[PDB]
Design a protein around this nucleic acid. Structure first.
Length: 45
DNA sequence: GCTGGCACGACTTTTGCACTCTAAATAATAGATCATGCTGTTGCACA
């Protein structure tokens, strides 16, 4: 908090752990060829 | 007759053209903070 955060909000800095969002139809797909790169490749049709 | 500022022939001064030739020693440490580009590392798909 504090107020080196008014500066952060106006500078539009991204946070360290952003929340990932989805699109119009986020059907459950879990993983799709995840392998080494990341994990749980979601494929909402 | 006495005196006080003007010119002249040596001398003197100025001026471009002209090319020159070691070790010491001084400060770091003690702002972070963020953005961006370059380079090496690794996961992924192909013949």
């Amino acid at each position: 908090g504090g107020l080196p955060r008014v500066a952060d909000l106006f500078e539009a800095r991204r946070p360290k752990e952003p929340a990932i969002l989805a699109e119009i139809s986020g059907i459950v797909s879990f993983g799709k060829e995840t392998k080494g790169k990341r994990r749980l490749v979601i494929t909402p049709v």
